[PDB]
């Protein structure tokens, strides 16, 4: 039935005078798709929305709300694009050269060479990784610390009751924020940024964004257990559990 939803958007977008309605109905379609993590689908709908719809549209609460929601969906989709790229790259990490204990002189020379080649292949890999890592962190944080009131939260209180929309959005927050926060931890921890992992406890517990309201108790426990893993790695470096030097 997907097509029925994703296609009815072509219809609404056809008529410029109907861009606000197109934005709103597209947001609705994408809210459903995002709830089932259908990002290609959502992206398929997202693109159909003329990249210039927002400018044109320019404010009833519903439209002000639709624009913000739309940017929230954009931030989310981007966080997943960058993450897929980071993920795909992380799984192309160069393989350490295999040792031939009791190498013959010829094998020692070959190994010296491969060893140095590996250090090159790996330092290049890590070089790209660093670019990708910095970018996906920026995207995650954009969603997680979404400007002016929170991701999928209306700034504008004067819209009419739409119980469906309003609870869909609370659902999205519950499905997407803890998820991002866990992905983010995987990224930080995988790339040895353990101190910043632990600062995830700041971000989540902060009254500013009140992220913890969106976590179930079980997910908070899981989060704590993950941070503990980062602490252990910091102990192995001769630091304290939060990454500070042991004075």
């Amino acid at each position: 039935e997907d097509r029925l939803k994703i296609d009815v958007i072509d219809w609404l977008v056809f008529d410029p005078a109907q861009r606000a309605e197109a934005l709103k109905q597209g947001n609705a379609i994408m809210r459903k798709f995002l709830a089932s993590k259908k990002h290609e689908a959502a992206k398929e709908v997202f693109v159909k929305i003329p990249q210039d719809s927002i400018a044109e549209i320019y404010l009833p609460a519903e439209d002000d709300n639709a624009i913000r929601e739309h940017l929230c969906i954009r931030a989310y989709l981007e966080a997943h694009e960058t993450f897929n790229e980071w993920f795909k790259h992380m799984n192309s990490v160069p393989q350490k050269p295999a040792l031939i204990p009791q190498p013959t002189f010829t094998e020692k020379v070959a190994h010296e060479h491969k060893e140095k080649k590996y250090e090159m292949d790996f330092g290049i890999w890590k070089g790209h990784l660093d670019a990708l890592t910095a970018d996906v962190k920026e995207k995650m944080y954009n969603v997680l610390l979404f400007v002016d009131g929170g991701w999928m939260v209306d700034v504008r209180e004067d819209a009419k009751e739409d119980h469906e929309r309003t609870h869909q959005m609370v659902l999205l927050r519950k499905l997407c924020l803890p998820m991002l926060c866990f992905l983010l931890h995987t990224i930080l921890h995988s790339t040895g940024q353990y101190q910043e992992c632990l600062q995830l406890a700041d971000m989540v517990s902060s009254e500013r964004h009140k992220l913890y309201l969106v976590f179930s108790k079980e997910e908070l426990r899981k989060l704590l257990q993950k941070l503990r893993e980062s602490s252990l790695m910091l102990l192995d470096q001769g630091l304290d559990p939060l990454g500070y030097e042991i004075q």
Partner: peptide, 20 residues
């Protein structure tokens, strides 16, 4: 007292443990 960043993190951690 030695690090503000650290006090926050510990506080945040402590708030999460409470919440969890």
């Amino acid at each position: 007292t030695r690090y503000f960043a650290k006090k926050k993190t510990l506080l945040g951690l402590s708030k999460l443990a409470a919440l969890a």
